[PDB]
Design a protein around this nucleic acid. Structure first.
Ligand SMILES: [Cl-]
Ligand SMILES: [Cl-]
Ligand SMILES: [K+]
Ligand SMILES: [Mg+2]
Ligand SMILES: [Mg+2]
Ligand SMILES: [Mg+2]
Ligand SMILES: [Mg+2]
Ligand SMILES: [Mg+2]
Ligand SMILES: [Mg+2]
Ligand SMILES: [Mg+2]
Ligand SMILES: [Mg+2]
Ligand SMILES: [Mg+2]
Ligand SMILES: [Mg+2]
Ligand SMILES: [Mg+2]
Ligand code: NA
Ligand code: NA
Ligand code: NA
Ligand code: NA
Ligand code: NA
Ligand code: NA
Ligand code: NA
Ligand code: NA
Ligand code: NA
Ligand code: NA
Ligand code: NA
Lengths: 46, 119, 81, 194, 56, 65
RNA sequence: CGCACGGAGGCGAAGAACCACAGAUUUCCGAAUGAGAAUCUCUAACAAUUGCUUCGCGCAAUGAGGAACCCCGAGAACUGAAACAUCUCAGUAUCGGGAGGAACAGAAAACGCAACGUGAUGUCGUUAGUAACCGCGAGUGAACGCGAUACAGCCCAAAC
RNA sequence: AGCUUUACUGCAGGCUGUCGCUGAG
């Protein structure tokens, strides 16, 4: 499929939101990403 | 159109408007249908003018028959802004009336007479 | 208002283009055209831009590969920052 | 003495006789070839207009609107309906044509507000009404002691909420006593039973 | 052919997409109308009373 | 901080702009250093450069440039 | 130096943090309005409909939103009647159009305890499940008045 | 509930008279 520049920005953001919770945030909060998506198991919008 | 039963020859109309201009500067005139109407009714009317380019025609329809059942003479004019200008207004006038002319009594007379003949 | 040049894109591949093709890579605002990327660069670093190739990255930003003229040296320019 | 106006009025008490008759037979020919809403520079019924609030001044507008004659243009039911609700032919709408006319006009002039309206005849298949609208924003009106009331925010879309004169008559608000139990202060407050 | 699993295989068409107006993935790219907010069909936002219990 | 409001208003329309372009360049060179994972950072200031630029722009508006 | 207690660093007696009011900034799509478009793009823009008009988008208006409330239109069926058609559910659900902080109503072509009486309008209590309707079945159902709340009365058309 | 018909009751539709549009001899 041919993605547009806007679609691409979104897919981009989705990839980023798909990162772990930084190591330090654990310490900084005396101690989980509820939005971890998988390319196979899950399904983005559009 | 619906209230016009005779066509006033250009020349005749020119004369009439002339008399009107002097009638305003020598005697008295009423400008505006309502005022004209009250002249024909109060009898104080000598010669009344009615435009042919009036829309709605309702505004003037009554003049002809009213004037007749009052012996008051009346004449038609083509333009509406001409009768108005003649009467001395910067606007137009659907109908005006000559309340006691002035140094025109002679002309107005003949005009009234010329019209009668124009049946 | 938005500025054209965001920052230098420093990665091994970007180095090769610098040490071998006299090319500097930058992260630029995605509303920027090649011609703008060119000017902005010539103005901020005082050099002569020969050609500018762009790419809208999967990172949400636009990457520009800028080749300087033979008079200028990419390595030297880059080094001062 | 009688007013000039009084004659216009007296002539329209019988739009089928006299000059007015001949007049209508003519105008309608032109009207039948005009659009749904036609702004007109001068009221066809001066006495009525002025009587209804008209006024030869800036911000006052008039337009003639034509609406089809007859009952409701209703579609027959496409699901279960008891004999009572299976009608189509005899059903009529609860807003009279004049009120339909006022609305089509007001929609044509989004910035204006309906002041009033009056009938100007009908042929075999349609009725014409002339609607008087007002520019609530023109200073010529914001300063008129006889019309500036229409400028208040709460007079916005007054026709669509039935605040017009034809609106209030159609809402059964004419009587102040017997028979108006389900109408005043409002149809809706009375559980829609008027 | 089974209307089940075997007919699922041809489903590679795109219809509903992210909506420029409401952000929901309900913009039918073939109809150019949002099934959620009505974008493309109505200037006013799509909303019905039946989206909640009558007395609420 | 190292830069204050008065000091910004004392400047002339020409002086602020010069100070602005100055800061912008410092900011850009800081980001570039960060782009290279450069650790000689002093994080507290890349933060300042932004607030400063805000201030000079805020004052520019107030003063009429 | 947000939630957020890390690491590094920084800001604050030039009175920071923090709070109140006012102001600056305020990307793109969005009523979305130059034109097109799944938030991007293409070459000056109140698009569209209107009012005024220097008849030039020059000056203005409308659009969309909002928890319900409010006003104007369109208008079911399950159900009840131990079936069912009028009736009932109900002018309810739902749909179309629109206003405001409230709406609507409102200074009698009223009432009609019939009077030598009351005196704009909403609303509350009552009048009353009364009068009235109804396969006179099931069911449906006011008003005047009264006691209260709050009170407020005016402007045109025409005659001249 | 779907379906049928000279089941009960109605509703569209078709045909037809009448009124309006509608006027002169
Ligand atoms: Cl309105
Ligand atoms: Cl009483
Ligand atoms: K039923
Ligand atoms: Mg990654
Ligand atoms: Mg490319
Ligand atoms: Mg109420
Ligand atoms: Mg199937
Ligand atoms: Mg656009
Ligand atoms: Mg039953
Ligand atoms: Mg029974
Ligand atoms: Mg009932
Ligand atoms: Mg009563
Ligand atoms: Mg007065
Ligand atoms: Mg059955
Ligand atoms: Na997937
Ligand atoms: Na970056
Ligand atoms: Na309007
Ligand atoms: Na009723
Ligand atoms: Na803001
Ligand atoms: Na506008
Ligand atoms: Na214009
Ligand atoms: Na039963
Ligand atoms: Na049954
Ligand atoms: Na019954
Ligand atoms: Na069945």
């Amino acid at each position: 499929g041919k993605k547009s520049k806007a679609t691409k920005k979104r897919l981009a953001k989705l990839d980023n939101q798909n990162s772990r919770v930084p190591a330090w945030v654990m310490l900084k909060t005396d101690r989980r990403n509820h939005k971890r998506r998988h390319w196979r198991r899950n399904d983005t919008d559009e | 159109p619906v209230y016009v039963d005779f066509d006033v020859p250009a020349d005749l109309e020119d004369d009439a408007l002339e008399a009107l201009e002097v009638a305003r500067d020598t005697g008295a005139v009423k400008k505006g249908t309502n005022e004209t109407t009250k002249s024909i009714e109060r009898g104080s009317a000598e010669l009344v003018f009615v435009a042919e380019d009036v829309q709605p025609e309702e505004i003037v329809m009554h003049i002809p028959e009213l004037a007749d059942e009052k012996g008051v003479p009346f004449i038609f004019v083509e333009q509406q802004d001409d009768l108005g200008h003649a009467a001395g207004l910067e606007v137009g006038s659907a109908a005006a009336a000559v309340t006691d002319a002035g140094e025109a009594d002679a002309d107005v007379e003949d005009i009234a007479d010329k019209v009668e003949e124009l049946r | 208002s938005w500025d054209v040049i965001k920052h230098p894109h420093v990665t091994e591949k970007a180095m090769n283009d610098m040490d071998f093709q006299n090319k500097l890579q930058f992260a630029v605002d995605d509303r920027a055209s090649k011609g703008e990327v060119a000017d902005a660069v010539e103005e901020q670093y005082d050099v002569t831009v020969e050609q500018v190739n762009t790419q809208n990255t999967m990172d949400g930003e636009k990457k520009a590969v800028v080749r300087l003229s033979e008079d200028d040296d990419a390595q030297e320019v880059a080094s001062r920052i | 003495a009688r007013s000039a106006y009084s004659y216009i009025r007296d002539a329209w008490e019988n739009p089928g006789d006299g000059q007015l008759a001949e007049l209508q037979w003519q105008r309608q020919q032109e009207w039948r070839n005009e659009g749904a809403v036609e702004r007109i520079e001068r009221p066809t019924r001066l006495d009525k207009a002025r009587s209804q609030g008209y006024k030869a001044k800036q911000g006052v507008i008039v337009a003639r609107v034509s609406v089809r004659k007859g009952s409701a243009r209703k579609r027959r039911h496409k699901a279960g309906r008891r004999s009572k609700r299976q009608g189509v032919t005899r059903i009529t709408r609860r807003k009279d044509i004049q009120r339909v006319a006022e609305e089509r006009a007001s929609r044509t002039f989004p910035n204006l507000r309906v002041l009033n309206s009056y009938s100007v005849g009908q042929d075999g298949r349609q009725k014409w009404h002339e609607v008087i609208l007002i520019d609530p924003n023109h200073p010529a009106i914001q300063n008129d002691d006889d019309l500036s009331w229409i400028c208040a925010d709460d007079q916005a879309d007054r026709v669509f909420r039935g605040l017009t004169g034809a609106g209030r008559r159609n809402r059964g608000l004419s009587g102040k006593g017997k028979g108006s139990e389900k109408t005043r202060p409002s149809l809706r407050s009375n559980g829609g039973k008027g | 052919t089974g209307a089940g699993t075997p007919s699922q295989g041809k489903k590679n068409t795109t219809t509903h997409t992210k909506c420029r107006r409401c952000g929901e993935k309900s913009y039918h790219t073939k109809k150019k109308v949002c099934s959620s907010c009505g974008f493309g069909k109505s200037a006013k936002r799509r909303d019905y009373e039946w989206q909640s219990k009558a007395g609420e | 901080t190292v830069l204050h409001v008065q000091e910004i208003r004392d400047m002339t329309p020409a002086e602020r702009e010069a100070e602005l372009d100055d800061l912008k360049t410092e900011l850009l060179n800081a980001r570039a250093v960060q782009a290279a994972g450069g650790a000689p950072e002093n994080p507290g200031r890349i933060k300042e450069l932004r607030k400063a630029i805000a201030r000079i722009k805020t004052i520019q508006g107030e003063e009429g440039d």
